[PDB]
Amino acid sequence: MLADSFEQEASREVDASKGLTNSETLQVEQDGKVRLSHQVRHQVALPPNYDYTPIAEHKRVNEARTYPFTLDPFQDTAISCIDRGESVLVSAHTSAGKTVVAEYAIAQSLKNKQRVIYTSPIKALSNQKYRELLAEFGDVGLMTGDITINPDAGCLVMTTEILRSMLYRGSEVMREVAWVIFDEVHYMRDKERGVVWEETIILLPDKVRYVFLSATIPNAMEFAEWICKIHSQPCHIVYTNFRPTPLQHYLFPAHGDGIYLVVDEKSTFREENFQKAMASISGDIYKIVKMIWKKKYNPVIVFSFSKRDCEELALKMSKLDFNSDDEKEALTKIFNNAIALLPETDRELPQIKHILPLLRRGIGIHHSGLLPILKEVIEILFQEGFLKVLFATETFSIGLNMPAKTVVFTSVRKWDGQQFRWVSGGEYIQMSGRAGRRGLDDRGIVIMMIDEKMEPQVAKGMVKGQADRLDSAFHLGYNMILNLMRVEGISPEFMLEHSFFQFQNVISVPVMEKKLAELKKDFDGIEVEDEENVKEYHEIEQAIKGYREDVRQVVTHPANALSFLQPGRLVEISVNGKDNYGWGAVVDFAKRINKRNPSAVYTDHESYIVNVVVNTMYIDSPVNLLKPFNPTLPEGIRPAEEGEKSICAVIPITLDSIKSIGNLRLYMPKDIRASGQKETVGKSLREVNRRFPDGIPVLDPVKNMKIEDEDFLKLMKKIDVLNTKLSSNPLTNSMRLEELYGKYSRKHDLHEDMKQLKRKISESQAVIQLDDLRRRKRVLRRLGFCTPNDIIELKGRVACEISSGDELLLTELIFNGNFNELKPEQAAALLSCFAFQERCKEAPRLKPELAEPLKAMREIAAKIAKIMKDSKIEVVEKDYVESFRHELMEVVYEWCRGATFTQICKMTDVYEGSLIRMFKRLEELVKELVDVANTIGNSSLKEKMEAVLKLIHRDIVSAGSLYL
RNA sequence: AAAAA
Ligand SMILES: Nc1ncnc2c1ncn2[C@@H]1O[C@H](COP(=O)(O)OP(=O)(O)O)[C@@H](O)[C@H]1O
Known about the structure:
It contains 33 helices and 24 strands. It is of the alpha/beta class. Strand 14, helix 12 and strand 15 (389-393) form a beta-alpha-beta unit. Helix 10 (325-339) packs antiparallel against helix 12. Strands 1-2-10-3-9-8-4-7-5-6 form a 10-stranded mixed beta sheet, sandwiched between helices. A 7-stranded mixed beta sheet has the order 12-11-19-16-13-15-14, with helices on both faces. 42% of the residues lie in helices and 16% in strands. The protein folds into 5 domains: 39-241, Rossmann fold, CATH 3.40.50.300; 246-465, Rossmann fold; 477-499 and 764-955, CATH 1.10.3380.30; 500-565 and 698-763, Up-down Bundle (YheA-like fold), CATH 1.20.1500; 566-695, Elongation Factor Tu (Ef-tu), domain 3. The two termini are 45 Å apart. The site of adenosine-5'-diphosphate (ADP) has 13 residues, from helix 2. The chain binds one RNA strand through helix 4 and helix 32. It is found in: Nucleus. Component of the TRAMP complex (also called TRF4 complex) composed of at least HUL4, MTR4, PAP2/TRF4 and either AIR1 or AIR2.
């Protein structure tokens, strides 16, 4: 249940600004200031019968911590919650000041001789927070996969995975913990890692209190109700849209000299400015940077979609120079101080050598490809303001204390792996946050380079959209299940029942039932149409529609259609059946060869790509974006609707998108698409539609294409049998048919909707993912990881202790003894298959000593995949076997034999940064494979694993962090 | 494509 709900207005005045324009962006005030206001919303979830006092009435007598500045309403409220011992979820933008709240919780815990845990999503963030907190409190420690420092500290900074582990082991630390702070909780919605947060939260004692720090989310109250329900305690939410440094949003149409303000500091969308920007749409990054360095709006960050891009843009800037030699002095000292902390052999590395020149010119690069030490030294140089321009990958925005005055996006679209799509509102929100250093800059500038006549409503949805929901991403894992079986007080079902996924599911039932009710009435508001005899007329037409589709499926099959798609052939295009491009003309076709992915499978209809000329293309469609032989048209590419101009274009399609084939062929220029050739085909297209006003002649499947299979003719006669049966109904000739059909069809639609919804609420009655739990239990029982009564076996106990790699395969390898006759260097090379994920250029064939153990483990892998398949788990057996990459087996092998980093870097195309990260994961995996051999009494194995650790842990691989 | 324990 909810209570104490209030919204509170806040208001300030800011220095007026013209930004990059010529007039004042906002109508100024008498004082010469600009007034901006923001909202602070509060609400609390209460357990049954709880004795609660309104939070605004609370007066804090003793402050556990004081601050130089005056607190914002959202901060004062959140701190009042903590002072009272009540959990709180703080939802605000990155710059707002959520650390102030977390700090107070820490101060309070330390004064009360209690312990407190601070969790973060990323190692990098952990280190930065440890460094920041240590300075302010002193009694601080750090727990991470890499480093452990002062574990007995009052305040522990650790990663969420590390906390998850502690809980399952039931450590004596939690017994003394009063508060647990979750920084960036919204990561709980991560498709792959999100479950870690949920799992961790559920496992916490009801005695502990929480501070959840999150970006602005629309469903914060849901999260709080869930906490309240599973931990039987109050949980507040403090939400605000407050933005410390006001933002200005600009569009930069490519290849132009214009720069347009489209969204001002009041989040007002400038309709006319946007119209001007789109009208001016028909090097640039260089122009823009120069303009920023000139107007003195640096430091600036330029986000690219790939590492490769960040480096190329960097080289195009080494012409410019932003630093005074007095700055180049302090800069280099910092750089060399850090570099000197590396082993002597590594201070000469190429990446280190080639990057310093840029740094001195004041140009930075930042992405996962860099050496860990280069990443942190560049982050530090940015803080001190020695770097005026930083070409960064999308991650930087996540990093704390790395804000910039100006932020530049090089494109309005992004490649998410599946589609080349528009940035979403949610994305863009988190994207705007990186601009504006709280104390230093009046305003923050955001610039987005655009190269397409985007529609207004699409632009609004992106530049002025809503924040994304915090939805559960819960799923089951074997390690998780085994641990829940093992631990005494709880079970796997317990986890399911307490998930936020299950919670959200339960909360939607009333929502769905309300909708059904609306539907039923709407369905009876039609009551009955005139005549039930229209039902027959509807069914007969439905069957015909279906049979006619089957006919189309045959006609368009390559075995029939291809012989009739000569250049110039008239075809009716309908891609996905939702985009009628009307009648186009075949340019050519070709069989589809997937070079990047061999084992990819094409349907017969997908197997051929047909190039087609259409003249119904929407005039503002991004035609420069569709690639050759790629049938997946980007969004924004659509047919023109009523009242829109059209153009000519060649688009790639499959045989599925051919609605019908015409009995005509117009002239197709052999001269490709060249300066006005296809526009003449559009002419011929226009003329043909005039020659045949009634309609375009369709090839007769039987009399022209000669399709006469016994089965196809049986089909073509089922249609006629109906086509007559229909034209003998009193309704075909009757009047008001187009009205009695519409009335009935709508009812039919309501009916279907109600049915499908009825299933939804039915399926939603049971606890979530029980079916999957059952199947995974089979796999575990079958492999002997536990008894049919779900009591954990030795295999299972081992598997629980394995977290850095596939727990099932690794446990099997260990028990089948696949490591017994392997030298340490061999063991390392094999395990790299469990520590490596990214794919790359196929590595040279493996020699016997490495290729053998590989094959012996792929056998065990297949044996497990088959079992996973038998259990009816959605898994591609072969793909699972390949899940474990071996592209670095020879790299790890040699490195364990003394080879230099510079030497192994020449064995692969994998970035230095990626190499180190995987070596560190391998160490982690090995450290786990040592704690295991302890709990198995395999002296032979423990020693071999300990030997692997020494071979790996050396040189640049074992180098420490700059911070700590 | 980019992040990531
Ligand atoms: N009420 C306030 N008035 C002025 N400055 C503040 C206030 N609250 C926080 N700050 C400052 O703003 C900066 C950003 O705060 P911080 O909490 O680090 O960001 P986050 O919201 O990501 O935790 C900090 O350096 C902090 O000192």
